[PDB]
Design a protein around this ligand. Structure first.
Ligand SMILES: [Mg+2]
Lengths: 56, 56, 94, 222, 98, 97, 146, 113, 226
């Protein structure tokens, strides 16, 4: 839930930086995919840390 | 005739196959371990029994 | 695993030559009815029937055991083929 | 029909027992109870308590002796003692030696109707001026009782020892399919028993079977 | 339920009525019209793949049925529901490599 | 369960052992009654299970339930086949298929 | 007569008979293709004093691995009302054989989620894992499949 | 059987005397396998409490439910005093008996993992 | 310090159910005694089952009877639930006769009574008959052990007889409880309770005794070594 709530505010910042014309449609799309890639990675590590520490 | 088959022929067959091996093959035969030799153990039932270690 | 397979591979320069020696010896045993064997009565491979212990019918099992004893000599050009065939039939008829 | 029972023994410490053929399922039906009994109920002897003169507790070290106290206690767990008198429920063994000597089991002061099966068992090596004065308590019992569970003290400074009573060290059993004529589902039971030599593997089995039969008589009187 | 009905394996009542006769081989229904309709049942017929198509009567003599009420179960249906199998008690656990 | 408690049986010794390993697994909350812990496992769809060979429990609580399972059209009776010698083909003289 | 026991007067196996591999379903004879018996057969026939029959046994038999209970027979001859066969065919016989099949080792099971497997072992009820109240389970599925 | 328990109750406390630790564990203040420091070394309660003369003793204790196969414990095997689980001892024994060479078996296994 | 023969309690409900308590027992003997008896009770207890059926004007199992609602497959499936108690121990086989007609629902009651033979579930439904429905059959019930499929025994009293799968075992369910107990000096003792369900042809107590005797007789086999 934490990583998702964080990811949504990050996504909002990329939308504000789009509508202001700082990044293109291309650049915005690329940044969104990157955010979700890293957010995915983060939750993977979280699944396995919780398993290792609390349910080995 | 299957009803004419008595119990001594099963014992005779055990003698026949003694020490002999058969080849088992599974398609696709991708490499040479697609065929391997096994000493058969006669079983009731219509299924061939395969050893776990050779499944890979 | 075949009993003493690692030692059997020790004896040959090529694993395939072991197969040739084993196969040929087993053919000799079958042709001459096992009476040319180099095994001793207690070394004979045995098979458990309903009756009890009987001789293992399998000539390939026999041949490998014989090989392990050391009593078999194998190689190339040891003896003319006809001479070998005739000497074996003189010693052990069919 | 009636299964044939087959015995293969090595000395007094090992035996394999094969019962075949049995009706389907009976291999594990017999094997499991016997194994449970053979581990838990077989009467044997163990070291339950030890006093070493200047040693206060289990983790102390003895001056002049190579082994620590823990190691000596361990060696004592390995001592195999056989009570010849049926009524003897316990014994105290004494050992005092010093100087340059490797103390074995035989060194224990002989006690009447108490046989030490493994007299060559090492206990401790003593250096110059090293001194070993100790009393060991040997009780009759069954199974395995940890030191903290029996809590036996003849005196203060007496150290309680995990009590390994069982003459049976290991039991392994394997059931495998076998055929009599047309029936292939029959069972073949192979039972493997390791003892310490005080009770023989064949003896232990017979004792185990007896206990179970007796327990079957308990279904008699409501 | 719908799968059995569209499959045409199961047998249903045309109109409201009362069941006159129930057999392994046939079911006779008396409708509102007064007309007596007889439904023969397909019993142990061999399909293209050799599975047995057979219909079993699910109603009894004197039963009041409505329009669309089940008369016979087709193959692989239980009281008009698609039955492709059994409900078994399962344990999820390894067992000795079997 | 409630049925059993009325029938005059309490928690089994082996049920306690399984409960021990289960609280080591973080499945049940420590300090609760044996009944409360069994109910915690049951809400996870797991039950105590006895090995019919030994009588001893499976060392952990196991998922058990009703599953819908079908027998498919591929049956060994149809597929098992063997040949010593038999029919051969017209031109090739090889065995038929 | 052991071989013909379950055949009716006309040579068709009777309804309700149990047929096993090798058993005759419909008896049939075919005229032997003209051939000169080998000198071995000349001598054999001469030794036993039995004329070689004109016809051979072409009977339909149960194939290997098949068989069951005979539930139906259809016989269609030529020259009987309502039936006309393809040219040259005197008569056609159909035998319908039924079998009740119990689940066995090698049969394939599956659930609706894609779990599929073949039955490798059928255990007696006493080996089956069971609930505290004595109920044995039906199926044991390996969690490694999930 | 070769995985070892890790428990949170002890949580790395220091103890001067091992009998203090066993007493603290007996009070239920510290778990058997919780990592702990007794004297200067960091050991676990189970390593002090259960010290087995040979493998057969460790496994007999498992049979009687004194310890599980995953509990870390002190076992004397082939002359050295080891900190492992009975399970890891059992694995080493499985290998050893299979190959009928006990020394080589001990060389091959990675026991601590 | 050695434990001594325990009190053996017996709680029975009718002929169907029983509870059998043994306490106190040495630690671990609860399953040591309980389990082999459970295994033996589920398998080796002799019993009775329908082994064959002849229905008049029915050539095989896949037939169907005019006037009857159930097909023969279902009829034989209902006969597999028939529980038949033999009062005379010397009696190994009985052929039950049934003749029924008219708009009746044939139950197990309708079997023509045979001496020294009691039907434990006479309400078991057998076939639904309709006006003109005629069911006349002969079912052969035998005494045996375990599960013998029709393919193994192949029992036919006459030509059109249909062999039936025979579940011989009278035991429906076996569970056993192991609870904690003390002699008040000593703890971790075992209290063993055998719960035994039966079809009524044999009694849970009778079942338990045969189970004990089988296990006892089996321990005998360890006598002559080799
Ligand atoms: Mg200790």
């Amino acid at each position: 839930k934490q990583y998702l709530e964080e990811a949504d505010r990050k996504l909002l910042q990329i939308e504000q930086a789009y509508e202001m014309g700082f990044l293109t449609d291309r650049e915005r799309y690329d940044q969104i995919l990157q955010l979700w890639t890293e957010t995915t990675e983060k939750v993977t590590q979280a699944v396995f840390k919780n398993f290792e520490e609390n349910y080995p | 005739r299957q009803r004419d088959i008595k119990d001594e022929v099963w014992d005779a067959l055990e003698e026949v196959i003694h020490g002999k091996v058969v080849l088992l093959n599974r398609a696709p035969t991708l490499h040479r371990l697609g065929i391997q030799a096994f000493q058969p153990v006669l079983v009731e039932g219509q299924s061939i029994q395969l050893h776990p270690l050779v499944c890979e | 695993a075949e009993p003493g397979i690692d030692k059997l591979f020790g004896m040959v320069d090529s694993k395939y030559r072991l197969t040739v020696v084993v196969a040929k010896r087993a053919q000799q045993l079958l042709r001459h009815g096992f009476k040319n064997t180099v095994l001793e009565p207690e070394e004979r491979p045995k098979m458990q029937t309903l009756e009890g212990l009987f001789d293992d019918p399998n000539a390939v099992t026999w041949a490998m055991k014989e090989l392990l004893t050391g009593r078999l000599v194998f190689g190339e050009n040891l003896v003319p083929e006809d001479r070998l065939q005739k000497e074996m039939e003189r010693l052990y008829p069919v | 029909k009636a299964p044939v029972f087959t015995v293969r023994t090595q000395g007094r410490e090992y035996g394999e027992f094969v019962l075949e053929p049995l009706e389907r399922g009976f291999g594990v039906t017999l094997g499991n109870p016997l194994r449970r009994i053979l581990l838990s109920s077989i009467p044997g002897t163990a070291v339950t308590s030890v006093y070493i003169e200047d040693v206060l507790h289990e983790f102390s070290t003895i001056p002049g002796v190579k082994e620590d106290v823990v190691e000596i206690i361990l060696n004592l767990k390995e001592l195999v003692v056989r009570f010849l008198n049926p009524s003897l429920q316990t014994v105290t063994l004494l050992l005092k030696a010093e100087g340059p000597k490797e103390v074995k089991a035989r060194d224990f002061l002989p006690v009447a109707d108490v046989e030490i099966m493994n007299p060559d068992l090492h206990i401790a090596t003593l250096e110059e001026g090293g001194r070993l004065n100790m009393e060991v308590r040997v009780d009759r019992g069954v199974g395995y009782v940890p030191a903290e569970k029996h809590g036996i003290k003849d005196r203060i400074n007496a150290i309680p020892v995990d009590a390994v009573f069982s003459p049976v060290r290991r039991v392994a059993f394997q059931v495998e399919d076998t055929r009599l004529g047309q029936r292939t589902d029959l069972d073949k039971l192979t039972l493997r028993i390791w003892t310490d030599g005080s009770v023989t593997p064949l003896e232990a089995l017979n004792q185990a079977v007896e206990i179970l039969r007796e327990h079957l008589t308990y279904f008699s009187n409501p | 339920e719908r799968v059995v009905r569209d499959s045409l394996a199961a047998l249903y009542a045309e109109e409201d009525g009362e069941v006159a006769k129930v057999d392994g081989n046939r079911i006779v229904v008396r409708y509102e019209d007064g007309r007596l309709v007889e439904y023969p049942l397909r019993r142990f017929y061999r399909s293209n793949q050799g599975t047995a198509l057979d219909q079993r009567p699910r109603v009894v003599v004197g039963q009041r049925v409505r329009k669309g009420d089940l008369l016979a179960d087709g193959p692989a249906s239980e009281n008009g529901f698609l039955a492709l199998g059994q409900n078994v008690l399962v344990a999820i656990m390894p067992f000795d490599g079997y | 369960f409630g049925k059993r408690k009325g029938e005059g049986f309490g928690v089994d010794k082996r049920e306690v052992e399984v409960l021990r390993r289960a609280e080591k697994l973080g499945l049940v909350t420590p300090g609760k009654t044996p009944e409360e812990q069994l109910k915690e496992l049951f809400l996870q769809g797991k039950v105590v299970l006895y090995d019919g060979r030994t009588g001893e429990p499976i060392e952990g609580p196991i998922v058990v339930g009703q599953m819908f399972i079908m027998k498919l059209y591929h049956m060994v009776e149809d597929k098992m086949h063997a040949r010593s010698t038999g029919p051969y083909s017209l031109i090739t003289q090889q065995p038929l298929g | 007569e052991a071989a013909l026991r379950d055949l009716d007067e006309e040579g068709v196996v009777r309804i309700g008979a149990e047929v096993k591999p090798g058993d005759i379903l419909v008896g049939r004879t075919s005229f032997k293709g003209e051939s000169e018996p080998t000198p071995e057969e000349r001598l054999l026939r001469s030794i036993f004093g039995e004329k070689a029959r004109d016809v051979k046994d072409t009977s339909l038999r149960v194939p290997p691995g098949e068989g069951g209970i005979v539930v139906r027979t259809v016989r269609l001859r030529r020259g009987d009302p309502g039936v006309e066969l393809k040219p040259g065919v005197r008569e056609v016989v159909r035998v319908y054989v039924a079998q009740k099949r119990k689940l066995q080792v090698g049969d394939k099971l599956a659930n609706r989620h894609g779990n599929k497997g073949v039955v490798a072992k059928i255990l007696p009820v006493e080996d089956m894992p069971h609930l505290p109240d004595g109920t044995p389970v039906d199926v044991i599925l390996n969690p490694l499949g999930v | 059987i070769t995985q070892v328990r890790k428990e949170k109750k002890g949580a790395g406390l220091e103890f001067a005397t091992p009998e203090e630790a066993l007493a603290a564990h007996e009070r239920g203040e510290v778990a058997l396998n919780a990592p702990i420091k007794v004297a200067g070394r960091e050991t676990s309660v189970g390593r002090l409490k259960y010290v087995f003369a040979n493998p057969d003793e460790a496994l007999l204790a498992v049979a009687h439910g004194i310890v599980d196969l995953q509990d870390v414990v002190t076992v004397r095997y082939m002359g050295k005093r080891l900190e492992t689980s009975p399970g890891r001892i059992l694995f080493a024994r499985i290998v050893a008996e299979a190959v009928e060479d006990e020394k080589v078996a001990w060389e091959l296994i990675q026991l601590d993992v």
